[PDB]
Ligand SMILES: *[C@@H]1O[C@H](CO)[C@@H](O)[C@H](O)[C@H]1NC(C)=O
């Protein structure tokens with residue numbers, strides 16, 4: 285179950301928790317998480333590595 | 334209590350074998366298929 | 382008493398307003414709620430929102446148009462095979478990529494995996510029609 | 513049982529989504545969480 | 561032909577999703593559901 289939760293988190297964002305699982309690229313997910321905290325997403329794409 | 338804290342999803346997923354995650358390296362919390370208990374090594378330290 | 386305090390918090394959040402806490406007011410995206418009274422208990426009906434009918438799309442994080450990277454304002458770039466569109470995050474609705482839909486930030490050599498395309502402003506056809 | 517209800521709430525909010533409650537999911541602005549199993553318990557790794 | 565059986569639990573259906581670095585699933589339809597909850 286723990287492995288399933290980790291799989292869903294790292295491949296689907298939070299969208300699997302409310303309905304059907306949708307794949308999404310991982311740094312795109314990180315961009316949405318910065319948009320969650322009031323940071324504009326272009327901060328991430330300049331500084332990824 | 335154990336069921337209501339863990340049983341939250343109704344499909345069992347799996348990560349793809351390719352690790353093209355843009356630079357992130359989740360090698361320490363992913364399960365390790367070289368062990369009879371398919372656990373991450375963090376879980377192994379927790380159990381030891 | 383512990384159950385009663387939990388039910389009180391459920392009424393004070395899920396019913397009198399909209400909560401963003403996932404799986405606090407039922408499974409899905411929460412919209413609203415109604416209470417009903419039962420002998421020594423309460424029964425909530427949560428009205429929630431669940432999407433369906435998903436499709437496959439190719440994406441790109443940014444667009445280098447004139448040497449400048451455009452980032453989508455709210456939503457995501459998608460491509461259906463031939464063109465590029467901006468859509469929001471939870472309903473498929475394509476639009477033409479505008480100056481109104483993106484904004485300019487930095488130079489397009491740093492971001493990994495940018496995709497060349499065009500950006501339509503309404504202002505050049507507006508000027509050239511009068512020209 | 514009280515602590516287990518707290519754990520289930522933390523699993524449902526910190527892991528499955530992104531909460532705005534300050535210091536619910538660890539110190540700092542919350543980004544995400546990963547769970548790990550443990551003997552009779554769970555261990556969250558909050559990324560902030 | 562009815563009788564009593566014993567079995568190992570099945571946790572749930574296995575479901576592998578096609579992850580890539582450049583693919584996004586976007587919903588098109590939606591449903592409004594009502595769920596009950598008793599306290
Ligand atoms: C992840 O980190 C471990 C620890 O050094 C390393 O052995 C492994 O090769 C890394 N994986 C990748 C894909 O870089």
Ligand SMILES: *[C@@H]1O[C@H](CO)[C@@H](O)[C@H](O)[C@H]1NC(C)=O
Nearest residue numbers: 435436437438577578583585
């Ligand atoms: C997206 O495409 C892949 C392979 O092209 C396929 O396996 C997958 O089922 C598609 N997604 C959907 C929702 O059909």
Ligand SMILES: *[C@@H]1O[C@H](CO)[C@@H](O)[C@H](O)[C@H]1NC(C)=O
Nearest residue numbers: 353355493494495580581582
């Ligand atoms: C995605 O992975 C493929 C693997 O073949 C790689 O060639 C491609 O460069 C990756 N995409 C980006 C944007 O780097």
